[PDB]
Amino acid sequence: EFYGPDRAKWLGPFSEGSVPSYLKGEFPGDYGWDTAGLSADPETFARYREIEVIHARWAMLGALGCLTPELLQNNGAADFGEAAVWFKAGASIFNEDGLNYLGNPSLIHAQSIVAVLLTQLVIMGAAEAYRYSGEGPVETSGDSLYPGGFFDPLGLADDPDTLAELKVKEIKNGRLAMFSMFGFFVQGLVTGKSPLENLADHLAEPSVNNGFASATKFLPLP
Amino acid sequence: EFYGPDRVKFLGPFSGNTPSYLKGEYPGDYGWDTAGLSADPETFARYRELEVIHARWAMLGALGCVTPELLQRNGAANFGEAVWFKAGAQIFQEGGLDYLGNPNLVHAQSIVAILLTQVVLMGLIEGYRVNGGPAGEVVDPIYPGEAFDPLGLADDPDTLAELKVKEIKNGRLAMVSMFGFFIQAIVTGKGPVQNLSDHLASPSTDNFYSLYAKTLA
Amino acid sequence: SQWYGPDRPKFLGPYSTNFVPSYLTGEFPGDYGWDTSGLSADPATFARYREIEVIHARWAMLGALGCVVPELLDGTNHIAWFKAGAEIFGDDGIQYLGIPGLINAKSIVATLIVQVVLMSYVEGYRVNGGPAGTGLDAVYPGGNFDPLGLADDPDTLAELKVKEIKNGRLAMLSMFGFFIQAIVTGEGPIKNLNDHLADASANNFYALYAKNLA
Amino acid sequence: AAGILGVLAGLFHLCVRPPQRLYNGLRMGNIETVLSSSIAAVFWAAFVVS
Amino acid sequence: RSGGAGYRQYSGDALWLPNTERPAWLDGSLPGDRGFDPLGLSRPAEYLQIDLDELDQNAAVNKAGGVVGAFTPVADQVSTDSLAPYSEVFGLQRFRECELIHGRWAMLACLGALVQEGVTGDSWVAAQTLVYNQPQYAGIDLPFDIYTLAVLNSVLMGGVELFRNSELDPERRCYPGGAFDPLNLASDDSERTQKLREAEIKHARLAMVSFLGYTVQAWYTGEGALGSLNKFANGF
Numbered sequence A: 001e002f003y004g005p006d007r008a009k010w011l012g013p014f015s016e017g018s019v020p021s022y023l024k025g026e027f028p029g030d031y032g033w034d035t036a037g038l039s040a041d042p043e044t045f046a047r048y049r050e051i052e053v054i055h056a057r058w059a060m061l062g063a064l065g066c067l068t069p070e071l072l073q074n075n076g077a078a079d080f081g082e083a084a085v086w087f088k089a090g091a092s093i094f095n096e097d098g099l100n101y102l103g104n105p106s107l108i109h110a111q112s113i114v115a116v117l118l119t120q121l122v123i124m125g126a127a128e129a130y131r132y133s134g135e136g137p138v139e140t141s142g143d144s145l146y147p148g149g150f151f152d153p154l155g156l157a158d159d160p161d162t163l164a165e166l167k168v169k170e171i172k173n174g175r176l177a178m179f180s181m182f183g184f185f186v187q188g189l190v191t192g193k194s195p196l197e198n199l200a201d202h203l204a205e206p207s208v209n210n211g212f213a214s215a216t217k218f219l220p221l222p
Numbered sequence B: 001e002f003y004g005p006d007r008v009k010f011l012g013p014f015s016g017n018t019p020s021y022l023k024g025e026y027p028g029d030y031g032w033d034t035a036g037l038s039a040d041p042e043t044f045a046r047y048r049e050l051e052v053i054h055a056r057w058a059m060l061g062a063l064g065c066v067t068p069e070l071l072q073r074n075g076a077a078n079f080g081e082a083v084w085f086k087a088g089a090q091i092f093q094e095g096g097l098d099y100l101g102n103p104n105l106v107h108a109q110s111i112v113a114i115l116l117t118q119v120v121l122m123g124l125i126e127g128y129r130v131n132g133g134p135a136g137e138v139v140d141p142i143y144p145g146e147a148f149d150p151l152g153l154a155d156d157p158d159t160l161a162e163l164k165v166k167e168i169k170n171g172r173l174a175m176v177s178m179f180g181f182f183i184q185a186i187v188t189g190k191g192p193v194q195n196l197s198d199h200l201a202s203p204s205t206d207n208f209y210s211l212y213a214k215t216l217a
Numbered sequence C: 001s002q003w004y005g006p007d008r009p010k011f012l013g014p015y016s017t018n019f020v021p022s023y024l025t026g027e028f029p030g031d032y033g034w035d036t037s038g039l040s041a042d043p044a045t046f047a048r049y050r051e052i053e054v055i056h057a058r059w060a061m062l063g064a065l066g067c068v069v070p071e072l073l074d075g076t077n078h079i080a081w082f083k084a085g086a087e088i089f090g091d092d093g094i095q096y097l098g099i100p101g102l103i104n105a106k107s108i109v110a111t112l113i114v115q116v117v118l119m120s121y122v123e124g125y126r127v128n129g130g131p132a133g134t135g136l137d138a139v140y141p142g143g144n145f146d147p148l149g150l151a152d153d154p155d156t157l158a159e160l161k162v163k164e165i166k167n168g169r170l171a172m173l174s175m176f177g178f179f180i181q182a183i184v185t186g187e188g189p190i191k192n193l194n195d196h197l198a199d200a201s202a203n204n205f206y207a208l209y210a211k212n213l214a
Numbered sequence D: 001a002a003g004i005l006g007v008l009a010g011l012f013h014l015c016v017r018p019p020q021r022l023y024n025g026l027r028m029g030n031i032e033t034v035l036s037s038s039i040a041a042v043f044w045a046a047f048v049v050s
Numbered sequence E: 001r002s003g004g005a006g007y008r009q010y011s012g013d014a015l016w017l018p019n020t021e022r023p024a025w026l027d028g029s030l031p032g033d034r035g036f037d038p039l040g041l042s043r044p045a046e047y048l049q050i051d052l053d054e055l056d057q058n059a060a061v062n063k064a065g066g067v068v069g070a071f072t073p074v075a076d077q078v079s080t081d082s083l084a085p086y087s088e089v090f091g092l093q094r095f096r097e098c099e100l101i102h103g104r105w106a107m108l109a110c111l112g113a114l115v116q117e118g119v120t121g122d123s124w125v126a127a128q129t130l131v132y133n134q135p136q137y138a139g140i141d142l143p144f145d146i147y148t149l150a151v152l153n154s155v156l157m158g159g160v161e162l163f164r165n166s167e168l169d170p171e172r173r174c175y176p177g178g179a180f181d182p183l184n185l186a187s188d189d190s191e192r193t194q195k196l197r198e199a200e201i202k203h204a205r206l207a208m209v210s211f212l213g214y215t216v217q218a219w220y221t222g223e224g225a226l227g228s229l230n231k232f233a234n235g236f
């Protein structure tokens, strides 16, 4: 279903002659989509595979992250004031009060932009450095892309049979995240509304409130 | 999952006592012959043909009883009577029955002509269905294929098996829902698209219990 | 023939005799050297890129012609290519040649549904064969796609392949011109040419656009 | 309208051979048959025109 | 590439019905042969010869003629007779020439009706009367009175059709070639010629049905080709 010659492919019934040789089904989510042929070199394929997975995991966090504040404040705590619409949430650190988590002044109450900058650079720098190094104090399992040695406390992946299917589940949920993250970006720029607000407009008038309603709002007027 | 002994059953977990003759050899076999109506293998075969035909007709009926109304509701067209249980009277109007509301379409003005044409056309193709005719010869009475599968979606045997279940399941759902269309028309007296809109507007008061209900008595 | 082999022309003309990628040997049409970035160093990537070029080209040639006709017809109101899609939202929707009754499309959802279904089959058939042809060359199928049997002589086919890619490459570059000119001028490509023909020195890119671009 | 049908009937009667049974029944090989039918047609027209 | 993915590559002879048999007289060699002849108009006709009725008034008894024999005349034989070149009316090759000539006229007519309606704005039916009263083309008034054009049309088409009838080879009557195939697209016996001829009958049959649509729509709606199209759209 997801490995071997009979695996599921991107073009479905017409994917028979679109499968690049080097793509054989030995890696998760190998639907055989390399029309341009960037993964012709095995080393470049190795690097691209890691980049895709890293992007997917970041996108998966981004998707949930970009919706949790707005969804909560739309019906719930309601503390997030105007910093709930992701794109327009960065200036939360520029609020006289401060970037208070869950709109709670006691929580974080950060106010220094340079501070969070340096902190993240140090926190992310070391972690990304360990990831590039291929070794660290934590268990590394030997696999940089899959260091479940310590990053897998629940041991949800103790047998290889599950790990395989689980790897496919990870990337496929990740791909949908990457695809949807690209959606958040474009919808933000084109509409200037939060992702749920765009969803609300579609539900109200699906025909009228679609992507083509804002098609002419980029026309290059003389 | 949908074939063989280790298949799914209509009674979920507590469905161990399934009839012997229902042993996962046909699409949609959930072991629901509680009345033993299909103990006879010959009667079971005929009932299977009856189920598929009733289902295929219902699927057309379900879609056809919504489109004329759904397009009218959205303002796409001006039908004579978009509601399915009043569309028949369109033939008695001054302008007859105009397809899509366009006078330059079918523009029928005679119910006798409609009936006579239907008897001859339905009579021939139904005879073709059971005996074979211009479209092809009969091999499987309910799964002819060939001319009736031009896209070749059932070319793969395994896919057809799976797709066979998909047809009867969408068909069975249509039969139930179309049965609902009949009852809701008799009770609500309003088209199913209208009835749906009402409930969705106020699912608390625009429900069958809040209205009608006791009225049926 | 002159377009194939080592004697083949080169993109730098005289200053390319000592500047030719080893992998480029003149065995494919439109081989003017170049490839200064080594993108097609991998033989597999070269084959994939070569197909994308001919595809992108055959599209650009359709696009280049298609972006001009509607702007060169009084019936279509000389509509600009970048301002044609909005016509679907017009009162009369899309009327081919500006003649009432033609198509009369008014729903952009219906057009996208038909385009997605029809183009998905067409592109799929181009990938793993189909009713038109099976086992034919990916970029040069022939048969149903060569009804007039123009390219039946291997020699003529070779020369015509160069003719296709060169007209196509010009169309690709000109289409990129159409894209940018539209974003800068804001008017149709034919309108731009008319202006440059009227007052060439007065109506150019630098006379009324370069300064406002920063 | 009679002219249009007269042309089309002339085309038919120019292409399709008479039936064998009708040819013998009406004696189509005998020109006196044409005289009998023409006399019949001309007195039909005389009654109408009167 | 293969395929067999989005289509069912069933093997058979494309006929006008999903399952049926070609008539014995419809082999399938001719372009566009779909085994369509339910009335058997191209079936080789059988005729009986009756003897000459006795009409001698010098004889005591004048018995009418009787069947002198049954003969099946050979069809598709062109002769030097200008008025009746073919041996039999009901021949496959004569009908194919009729099908092609009727079809080629319809192709010009179907395009001609559309173009003049989109150029002049006048219905093709109303076009006939307008040109009759004021000879004109593309809005330009022609320099010839209608009386001369009437004679010229009959004389020009008379010569043109008399030239056409000179040909004796039945296949060349349907496909003259020569000056009428300057590009030599389908002058050889290749498969491309067969495919091109298959395209021609399809476009020809389409145009024959299409122009039959024009006349009936003009009879019923009262509008022309483009006009009927506009009427239908507004009808909604």
Ligand code: CHL
Pocket (backbone or CB within 6 Å): A212, A215, A216, A218, A219, A220, C081, C082, C083, C084, C085, C086, C087, C088, C108, C111, C112, C115, C179, C180, C182, C183
């Ligand atoms: C290559 C395909 C393609 C391209 C380049 C465009 C381009 C455009 N469409 Mg469009 N469309 C295309 C396909 C399709 N459109 C539509 C339906 C519509 C509608 C309904 C509308 C448009 C409109 C527009 C214009 C947006 C307003 C404007 O002037 O912005 C300025 C933009 C530019 C000057 C050019 C921007 C393009 C950039 C240079 C890159 C071009 C290549 C891209 C990779 C695009 C790839 C497309 C596919 C493969 C994903 C714009 C020029 C709008 C319009 O014309 O209103 C005035 C509009 O209302 N399109 C359909 C479905 C029927 C398409 C199907 O393929």
Ligand code: CLA
Pocket (backbone or CB within 6 Å): C059, C061, C062, C063, C065, C066, C067, C069, C070, C073, C076, C079, C084, C085, C087, C094, C095, C096, C097, C098, C099, C102, C103, E114, E115, E117, E118, E119
């Ligand atoms: C990939 C290339 C490409 C693409 C994406 C487009 C896309 C588009 N073209 Mg275009 N075009 C192209 C290439 C392309 N074209 C080329 C190469 C040419 C030169 C032949 C043209 C010439 C052209 C014209 C003249 C027009 C368009 C128009 C359009 C727009 C609407 C298309 C339509 O009406 O529906 C689809 C079209 C068809 C399905 C063709 C069917 C034609 C009908 C059925 C019959 C033709 C009319 C007939 C001759 C009229 C009869 C009477 C007459 C003889 C007087 C659309 C955005 C129209 C427009 O209004 O722009 C906004 C328009 O008028 N194109």
Ligand SMILES: CC1=C[C@H](O)CC(C)(C)[C@H]1/C=C/C(C)=C/C=C/C(C)=C/C=C/C=C(C)/C=C/C=C(C)/C=C/C1=C(C)C[C@H](O)CC1(C)C
Pocket (backbone or CB within 6 Å): B032, B033, B034, B035, B036, B037, B054, B055, B057, B058, B060, B061, B062, B063, B064, B065, B083, B084, B085, B087, B088, B175, B176, B178, B179
């Ligand atoms: C299995 C079992 C077993 C055990 O043992 C016992 C028991 C339980 C008994 C069993 C069960 C059974 C069942 C359930 C049954 C059901 C049935 C149905 C409901 C059907 C429907 C059925 C239904 C159907 C067909 C439907 C149809 C419809 C149609 C055609 C339609 C038509 C139309 C249209 C479109 C529209 C218009 O306007 C009108 C009209 C014209 C009218």
Ligand SMILES: CC1=C[C@H](O)CC(C)(C)[C@H]1/C=C/C(C)=C/C=C/C(C)=C/C=C/C=C(C)/C=C/C=C(C)/C=C/C1=C(C)C[C@H](O)CC1(C)C
Pocket (backbone or CB within 6 Å): C034, C035, C036, C037, C038, C039, C040, C056, C057, C059, C060, C062, C063, C064, C065, C066, C067, C080, C081, C082, C083, C084, C085, C172, C173, C175, C176
């Ligand atoms: C060789 C080399 C080598 C080294 O190594 C590196 C380097 C340098 C990088 C390289 C280079 C490259 C290049 C130059 C590229 C370019 C490209 C392009 C521009 C394309 C286009 C491309 C383009 C294209 C396709 C286009 C297309 C178009 C189209 C379809 C159109 C459509 C349309 C029409 C008709 C009209 C309407 O109204 C609108 C529309 C709808 C819109």
Ligand SMILES: CC1=C[C@H](O)CC(C)(C)[C@H]1/C=C/C(C)=C\C=C\C(C)=C\C=C\C=C(C)\C=C\C=C(C)\C=C\C1=C(C)C[C@H](O)CC1(C)C
Pocket (backbone or CB within 6 Å): A033, A034, A035, A036, A037, A038, A055, A056, A058, A059, A061, A062, A063, A064, A065, A066, A085, A086, A087, A088, A089, A090, A178, A179, A181, A182
């Ligand atoms: C096919 C293949 C092969 C051939 O050969 C060629 C080609 C074509 C090249 C290829 C393709 C590819 C594709 C298709 C695609 C890509 C995509 C993407 C979109 C990614 C993303 C990706 C994406 C991503 C990562 C994203 C991420 C995001 C994030 C983290 C976010 C964050 C945040 C939050 C939470 C919230 C706040 O308020 C803000 C922030 C702080 C900002």
